[PDB]
Ligand binder design. Structure first.
Ligand SMILES: COC1=C2C[C@@H](C)C[C@H](OC)[C@H](O)[C@@H](C)/C=C(\C)[C@H](OC(N)=O)[C@@H](OC)/C=C\C=C(/C)C(=O)NC(=CC1=O)C2=O
Length: 214
């Protein structure tokens, strides 16, 4: 319940500020980036399990799941991958990405397409193309479930999770969509973005759709 507050390394702050404010036209690339991250996390729990099969037991099903939450203007991207500990959330989302953000920012200033962001290993931050706030909710086998929260400002919070559904293992990216990016809540649009940029994914991609019965 009591949150802890941390400062972003200056370079990450710089990268986020640029992305949340950019008028780049191909914002849909965020979904490919987050699906790729989900796939990586799943690769890692699968590989870890080769020599430690009990690691799968916390969530035997390996999947990527996409859930639009229209009333809240939220889009969730979930995986049952390896997940992240508290220390991992703090270090990797707040500091380790710093250098990668610098080289990528230099490439941007030179004319690189924002879509290159994954090749510089900082594609997580592409979520700010469509969202002005994010909660990363994560459960590693090695720690409790935690919430990392950022609004692209210079600081982020980490809080022990006593408010969200239990995930057996893995991560939820909960995107709070900008008012002009609500198209990414629609089933039709989501399918077309997946089919276009994520053709070769080794894991099931599940879409959770809410429909009124008549
Ligand atoms: C190859 O590893 C990747 C790294 C190196 C490093 C951070 C990996 C991380 O180390 C603790 C875990 O091993 C890994 C399993 C966790 C994820 C991929 C998370 O995604 C999900 N769904 O768990 C991702 O998002 C919340 C966290 C950070 C992503 C960043 C900063 C990024 O921008 N791009 C990156 C994409 C990557 O694939 C990246 O830096």
């Amino acid at each position: 319940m009591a949150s802890e507050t941390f400062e972003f390394q200056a370079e990450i702050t710089q990268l986020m500020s640029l992305i949340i404010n950019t008028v780049y036209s191909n914002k849909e690339i965020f979904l490919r980036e987050l699906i790729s991250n989900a796939s990586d996390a799943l690769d890692k729990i699968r590989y870890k399990s080769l020599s430690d099969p009990k690691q799968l037991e916390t969530e035997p099903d390996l999947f990527i799941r996409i859930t639009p939450k229209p009333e809240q203007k939220v889009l969730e991207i979930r995986d049952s991958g390896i997940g992240m500990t508290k220390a991992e959330l703090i270090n990797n989302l707040g500091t380790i990405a710093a250098a990668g953000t610098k080289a990528f920012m230099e490439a941007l200033s030179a004319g690189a397409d924002v879509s290159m962001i994954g090749q510089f290993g900082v594609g997580f931050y592409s979520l700010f193309l469509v969202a002005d706030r994010v909660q990363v909710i994560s459960k590693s086998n090695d720690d409790e479930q935690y919430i990392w929260e950022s609004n692209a400002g210079g600081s982020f919070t980490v809080t022990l999770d006593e408010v969200n559904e239990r995930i057996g293992r893995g991560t939820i990216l909960r995107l709070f969509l900008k008012d002009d990016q609500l198209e990414y809540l629609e089933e039709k649009r989501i399918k077309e973005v997946i089919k276009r940029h994520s053709e070769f994914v080794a894991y099931p991609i599940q879409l959770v759709v809410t429909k009124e019965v008549e």
